Symmetry: D2
Subunit: 393 residues, 4 copies
């Protein structure tokens, strides 16, 4: 292992800063000072830090306190070298956001959440963030008739397009990344998966600067294939940022260390981010951000162990994934399974639909029974990945 700033490992203030209050109990750890967070992360090898507005500046803070806090915070960044690649807004903790921010049924709350966002774009630009994340955690319902489902999406579009037009208007070098979550805190959250988020962006006026921020655990909460889902985001050129963590099953959002959830899936996630596609295509070159929570059973030595562990796991997996693809038995196994064959277009250069239809060899005279004999050898190919992952090869 041994991470270095070149690796682009970024951590949120709320991750290591998470004190342990869950639904059935109080905090088990003392508050973490943000200046202490910066110094500790930088010592460990992180490249940058992210935060929610209220992670740094209390909801209550007076103008004088905002500036006091920011001066110390900017000093620490200076002292250490950490960048601030992403900034986000808390539109979920305060009681006012109980029915959402942007899709709150109350119009005065929608205006209040949108202004909170607009002000936060100003700080984002001031900090040098390239990405502004939006996780609509309270946008949804417990009951199906609580909302006019079409109006909720119109109100979501108004907020996102107002914010986007504001970025464009000010010429900030910022992009919006939406973050999908199927449920929790709401019984049903709007734009629950990568797909729903991607689809929604296509209905926006300012869609060009809006992309996604998928999170491992979140897609796994709907039982989906995370690599499949980031693949589709990348393919659409909408994978703007990423949150890496662990989740074991469909249950509450666990936010374990990356690699402490579905290990085999984490491996293929790393192969996609590091290696990209077998036949070539797009690559994700942004930060490797960890949106996790250090288990409440553990003290501060567990907090810094867990931060370390996120980075180690990614570097261990990276290593095994480079070895796996480089392996000539793997490349031959890949060749056999038709991995490169899928890259070939289906139609010959210039062939029309009409041409393929009436090509006797592709249909009328095709031997479907003989084509069905093909041994795709997907099991053997899977077996080679696991052995590479197990450090066995």
């Amino acid at each position: 292992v041994q991470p270095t700033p070149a690796d682009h490992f970024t951590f949120g203030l709320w991750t290591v800063g998470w004190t342990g209050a869950d639904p059935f109990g109080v905090a088990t750890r003392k508050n973490l000072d943000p200046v202490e967070a910066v110094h500790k992360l930088a010592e460990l090898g992180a490249y940058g830090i992210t935060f929610h507005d209220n992670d740094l500046i209390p909801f209550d803070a007076t103008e004088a306190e905002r500036e006091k806090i920011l001066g110390d915070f900017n000093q620490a960044l200076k002292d250490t070298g950490l960048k601030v690649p992403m900034v986000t807004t808390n539109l979920f903790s305060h009681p006012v956001f109980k029915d959402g921010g942007f899709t709150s049924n109350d119009r005065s709350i929608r205006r209040f959440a949108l202004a909170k966002v607009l002000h936060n774009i100003d700080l984002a630009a001031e900090m040098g963030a390239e990405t502004f994340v939006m996780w609509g955690g309270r946008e949804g319902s417990e009951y199906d008739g609580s909302k006019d489902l079409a109006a909720a999406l119109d109100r979501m579009r108004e907020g996102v397009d107002t914010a986007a037009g504001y970025i464009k208007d000010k010429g900030y070098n910022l992009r919006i990344a939406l973050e999908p979550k199927p449920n929790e805190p709401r019984g049903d959250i709007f734009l629950p998966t990568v797909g729903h988020g991607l689809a929604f962006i296509e209905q926006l006026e300012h869609g060009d600067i809006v992309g996604l921020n998928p999170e491992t655990g979140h897609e796994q909460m709907a039982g989906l294939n995370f690599t499949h889902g980031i693949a589709q985001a990348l393919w659409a050129e909408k994978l703007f940022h990423i949150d890496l963590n662990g989740q074991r099953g469909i249950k509450y959002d666990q936010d374990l260390v990356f690699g402490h959830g579905d290990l085999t899936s984490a491996f293929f996630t790393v192969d996609l981010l590091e290696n990209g596609f077998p036949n070539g295509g797009p690559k994700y070159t942004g930060p490797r951000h960890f949106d996790y929570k250090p288990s409440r059973t553990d003290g501060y030595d567990g907090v810094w162990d867990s931060a370390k562990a996120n980075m180690s796991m990614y570097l261990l997996l990276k290593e095994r994934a480079l070895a796996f693809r480089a392996d000539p038995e793997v490349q031959e196994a890949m060749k056999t399974s038709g991995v490169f064959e899928l890259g070939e277009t289906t139609l010959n250069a210039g062939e029309s639909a009409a041409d393929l239809m009436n090509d006797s060899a592709s249909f009328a005279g095709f031997d479907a029974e003989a084509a069905a004999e093909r041994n795709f050898a997907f099991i053997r190919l899977n077996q080679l990945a696991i052995e590479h992952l197990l450090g066995s090869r």
Copy 2:
């Protein structure tokens, strides 16, 4: 109850025709003749019938048999009055489609599946279908490295855009509807949810004639809110057809009768299709198609009971949903919860992002603590829907 053709209840041939072979056992019912299917459905009050190419014409059938089968089939339609609103292709039963049709790793199979589709568009147009459904049941994997995820989506786009360009080329009055499914038969199926399907359509060259065919049970297999998901399809103006059935939980695709799964959700599904949105907007006016399977424990009297039951459930639920929205206590409950308030734009006519930011009343001088006191009364509003559903009001 009592359905009539005006209700637009359509059934697939494979639904009532399902003989009971599941993964752990053989068929428990005798094959259903298609001409018997047409006569029986029409007697029950159905409006139309749908089918997969191989539901009617065996894979093997010679040209002479195709025409014999179609003549009898067209005669029965004539005899009875049933329309054929949707046609689809089987790209999953034959051993040749073991790695998919359109995204098969084998290029010769991709060509064979696309030609099978092209020929089937011709029959679709011949039959008077307005919708051509595409359920990519074998498009996916069990193992993450079996596929080049970007190439799979390029091969999916090539098939769908070739088929679409073919419709446009021939001037058929047909639209393509993709049908999402999270898993089964594959461990992970591409375009697993409504969202993923919607997003994918936006990357197509011929996206204008491509929409979705969501299925109750399928979105429920990822634990999603079906009404939420069809809401988003409708909002995007992509809800081209629908498959209604029942599913109890995240497990195998059960395909129970509509209403025999998640009842409360079926109720709100019916409220959305019949009533549309509380503040007005889009409406789904296509057929009410039932993609279900009559439980294998039951004989043919259970088959016709189940067909009846699909229609009854929808009409019972429709009744309760009309009463619920018409109810003045419900409309006042709705008013109280802010259902109509969400329809109001957030920004005043002409207000800019800049204007809202610096409006002291929306941010600086906003009383967030007072706005948080609002009783949204969502529980009471839910309670009124259940009582209407229970026939209690």
Copy 3:
């Protein structure tokens, strides 16, 4: 439907008293005075109230304070007539319980937890409770190597047998009810389902006074059929208490109002509680307790509405379920499907194994293809039940 004390609707103090703090935000409602909870519930028709030691008496409460609180609460009970059928212990909120109470890895903590339970048995006895509930919320792990799993069960056994032994010694008219939950707050909780709870009880020294307290939503968090789970518990005579609420799928513990989750399942649980088993058998006679949480979106008017909705839902389901079994059409359908034939022993009186295998009629010349022809008509029985549920019959 108007509840009367005779209905036996019990409510925990923590239910209507739930303030709204969740993992992503703060309390939305002010604390509830216990005196007031008692009075309000008494006006609604509640029969009794239940509580956790710390819901009533603060963790750090001095003795003078404990006496006052108890004085106020016993005054309230005397004034209103509310009974206190169950008392439980909080072994999950204080940070000392972060790895469990009874199965904490730290021995001093295990000792404290058992002491804390023993004292609470005295209190339970002085309050007149018949049931003592144990919900081991912190008993489990996030990670598989955290626990010696055989040793966690010995530790669990030690604690519960010590508590049972003490009950017996003291002559208290108290039974212990264990309550399963699959996950949350821990990634995996010990004794996660009704099956695991019943199984563990059989390894206990004092299992005769140890039974279960299943909760609707907890069984649905593993995707099990709650009606089937309480039927096993009844069948083993181990259904000592029940916790009624609603859950809308496999996700975080929702604790919605009873019937605000899976509706048909709610209906069939009510049918089991009220009508018992179709061929007779044990019947559940304890409190009909609601362990739910008033959505945080709702103000105090919502709290009493939701309290009321629980009893309304239950009474509405009871009315329907009584009509359902009383229907001649329903009884006929039941007959046809073999619901009453299941109740007949398989063997004949004094028919042994050998007698049966040698009986020619039963095996050697049994016509399996003719037997397989039976139309069980389970679909039609199900349709009849739903029609009773919707009150269209």
Copy 4:
């Protein structure tokens, strides 16, 4: 890693013999001659083979045919040396079993099923099997009113006690292993988890020779922790057999190769099977049986590869898990986290309940805030385990 007969790898005939028929398509592979299965498995290092009555002997097999088949298969066994450790009955494939075998609603069917089992006990005994497995696949319902649930358990009990009684009477050296599955093929299956299986066994007349046969993927279909489930079964001394495979989430029964599902869980199951409990306790000593299905995409080369992958995966996990516990660093971490302190009884020798509640140190003056400071360091213990798993240590 090369398996030897000493490893005790057993395979069902239906596993490598699985032809590829699923719910959406036909068989992709030709039938496997049983003689050949035996020989191939013997060359790979299998120790034994298992089967279902009908995998070997057709349902309609005449007596002359049954004798031949048995002759061929016993020849094969004699030639290769393969043992037959478990035999099971098919009570799910024929349409007669559509509502179950033992808990079918039709009494004549229940009789046939019990007869069919009794005969198969004779066969099992003649083959030299130590275990008799019962997987009640058709025992359950799709709908809640289909069964008298107390009566379904009496019927289940009757059947299993009759089979156990008969074993005892005949003097066979056979134990019965019940195998839970939550759903599929039925919507809900009776005795769905290890907990339910263990619980039911305690209500049996002859429960002493009745234990469990848990399957990896089945527990993961309810989202439970398989390692925790087999630990309860071990702890109760009821782990008679095990079925190893992989499952990638809550969905249809995948039956992938062992380790091709949840990897860390596989690792921790292997650690439990090989290393036992950290503080000692019972140990599992039966066959390491694989109940998997070779993906249908793969030809016969894939079948033997996958067979082989199962034993490779298991041996690789064993190597790692032995290294893991042998590591001093790992043992130190274990010490720190209290893995060995869990094993110490909570009470002191001859310390009663009263002694403890009155012990001041344990409760009255226990410093709960100081105890809560303990850093359990479960995260770091977990990181060490994963690092052993990936062989980076």
